Design a protein around this ligand. Structure first.
Ligand SMILES: *[C@@H]1CC(=O)N(c2cc(S(C)(=O)=O)ccc2F)C1=O
Ligand SMILES: [Cl-]
Ligand SMILES: [Cl-]
Ligand SMILES: [Cl-]
Ligand SMILES: [Cl-]
Ligand code: NA
Ligand code: NA
Length: 353
């Protein structure tokens, strides 16, 4: 048997540029074991690594940085000689960075209508890469798809409402990923949430009653006053959002001056958001005589203080409100909480462009 000679294999090539940092760097020995492996950046600072017990694999154990020039030295020893290699490579230098933000929060329990939300703080030129970098796990597994509400936020939901008890895991692995036009991910995100009870509240303009159903059983019937004809509440499916014991409604947040005929600024109690456009379920003492009879608001579902607080107490983010038989149209699918009004075939087809 003649002298066999160890060989070295690295996941980077000497002289390479634009190396993406979305993966560790590794060195592998063949016909021999690794005796020494070091990796330092342009300033001489070492990079954390781990050699496998069998001595055949060394990998970086920490995140690698943008705009860095790394130098790698590896020595492989064997029964028939040795082999050494020095490799230098330069990582990606982004033109701009973008940090994602994921809802719902880690560990939260949400209703059957809560979609996965990934919001970036910059415009995403390559939506496809963003979608490819986002891995969603569901238990029991269910089909879902991506759909963008605007140039910075994407959503992921199944065809129908979640089944209660479903576990969802979200891993936004955007670090080191070219998201288009030199826009690279600033970090990764990992969120996990669970689907709770089915809570569907239906507001019928014919009866002017807001009926809350938990697991299919009617548990509360609230006389309500919705948007008047000139500013009606839109029919469709609303996703419950944030909740406030009290909040100052200010029309100027939507570009409508407070000092207008259609502007407003008032403080209200027990407000539950259900649309970005400003539809809330809140306490309306000034309209109890109208609640259950005639509509008098700008879209908000007015109810009594008792029922408003009840809604605040018994409804959670992700629960569903459905408005039907109003003089208005359908809530826009891209409102922010109207995801379910987009027909499944359009949502499934996505808009990655
Ligand atoms: C709750 C009280 C109310 O009627 N709205 C509301 C306002 C508007 S807007 C910004 O004037 O067009 C749209 C829909 C609404 F429900 C509240 O904010
Ligand atoms: Cl090392
Ligand atoms: Cl932000
Ligand atoms: Cl009216
Ligand atoms: Cl507001
Ligand atoms: Na020989
Ligand atoms: Na008002």
């Amino acid at each position: 048997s003649d002298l066999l000679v160890p060989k070295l294999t690295a996941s980077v090539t000497d002289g390479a540029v634009g190396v993406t940092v979305d993966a560790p760097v590794s060195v592998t020995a063949a016909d021999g074991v690794l005796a020494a492996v070091t990796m330092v950046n342009d300033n001489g600072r070492p990079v954390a690594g781990r050699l496998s017990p069998d001595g055949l694999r060394w990998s970086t154990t920490e995140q690698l940085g943008y705009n860095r020039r790394y130098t790698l030295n590896a020595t492989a020893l064997g029964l028939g000689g040795a082999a050494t290699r020095q490799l230098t490579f330069q990582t990606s230098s982004p033109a701009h960075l973008t940090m994602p933000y994921v809802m719902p929060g880690d560990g939260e329990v949400v209703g059957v209508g809560e979609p996965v939300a990934i919001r970036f703080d910059e415009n995403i030129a390559d939506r496809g890469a963003a979608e490819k970098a986002i891995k969603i796990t569901t238990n029991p597994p269910v089909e879902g798809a991506f759909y963008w509400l605007n140039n910075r936020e994407v959503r992921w939901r199944p065809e129908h409402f979640w089944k209660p008890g479903t576990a969802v895991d979200v891993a936004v692995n955007t670090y080191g990923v070219d998201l288009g036009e030199g826009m690279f991910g600033e970090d990764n995100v990992q969120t996990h949430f669970t689907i709770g009870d089915e809570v569907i509240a239906t507001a019928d303009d014919n009866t002017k009653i807001l009926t809350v159903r938990v697991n299919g059983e009617v548990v509360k019937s609230m006389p309500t006053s919705m948007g008047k004809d000139s500013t009606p509440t839109a029919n469709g499916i609303y996703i419950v959002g944030s909740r406030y014991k009290h909040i100052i409604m200010d029309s100027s947040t939507y570009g409508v001056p407070v000092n207008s005929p259609n502007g407003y600024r008032t403080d209200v109690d027990w407000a539950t958001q259900i649309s970005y456009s400003g539809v809330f379920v809140h306490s309306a003492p000034w309209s109890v005589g109208a609640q259950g009879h005639t509509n008098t608001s700008h879209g908000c579902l007015n109810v009594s203080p008792s029922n408003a607080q009840w809604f605040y107490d018994h409804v959670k983010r992700g629960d569903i409100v459905e408005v039907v038989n109003t003089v208005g149209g359908t809530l826009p699918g891209i409102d922010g909480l109207g995801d379910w009004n987009i027909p499944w075939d359009q949502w499934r087809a996505g808009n990655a462009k």
